[PDB]
Symmetry: C3
């Protein structure tokens, strides 16, 4: 199995989820802060440049079978794409083992 981790623009989430549901995929979502090319505003306070604005991102973590992860990566990438800065990244990690807690 593969854990597909997508850091995306928050307003893209439901388009990504519709793309996932289209492929027969449940997922787990987190709110995170993004640092990268696109920057927020800062302010100097006591020898440090403090971030005064921040760039919310949505992290989608979804476990999938090896036989669908490539299709899932492309669907997320196409559903999350705008062509503008701050689009984000997809990281695929291998799952050594997965368990369904409800049944075992």
């Amino acid at each position: 199995m593969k854990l597909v981790m997508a850091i995306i623009k928050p307003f893209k989430l439901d388009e990504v989820r519709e793309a996932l549901t289209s492929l027969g995929i449940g997922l787990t979502v987190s709110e995170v802060k993004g640092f990268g090319r696109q920057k927020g505003q800062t302010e100097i306070y006591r020898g440090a440049e403090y971030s005064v604005s921040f760039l919310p991102k949505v992290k989608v973590e979804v476990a999938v079978s090896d036989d669908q992860y490539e299709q899932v990566v492309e669907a997320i990438q196409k559903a999350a794409n705008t062509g503008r800065i701050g689009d984000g990244k997809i990281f695929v990690l291998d799952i050594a083992q997965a368990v369904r807690i409800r049944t075992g």
Copy 2:
């Protein structure tokens, strides 16, 4: 080493932690939003079905040695289990390398 990631019902956390402490395991906990078979309420607003309720989950991330990860997976699964919908998932990922920041 293995990174064990458990998405569980929030009210199960302290039972899972007691199960971990029983096996000699520190852990890191996140609040996440769950999508899956169990669904929340939605509402139509401007060409989109907006989620008006959500399903909080607790994400437990705990790094363990290979010689205890199987026991850890089963303990979390048994401590997190209710037999009801929304129980969640456990994903085990391989750790290429781990570092204790305090000592190096």
Copy 3:
């Protein structure tokens, strides 16, 4: 590629980020709750010991090339280090595949 996951003291974040920027590294940050040797206060309420204080941590997740991950691990470890309890951990995970959403 490698996904470097660092659980650190929140007040260390900007020092870690400066250490990352020094090496030519964007990153994704989460707020998490820490359990470990350093403990918070609890209170007995209805057959359970409830946590009344908690230990905020910052989770840094940064994807890097294999040819810089060791340097990145050490830079984070040195920038996040205080020598005091609660310093945290670094877990390195292998990335099977990464995608830039903006371009594909």
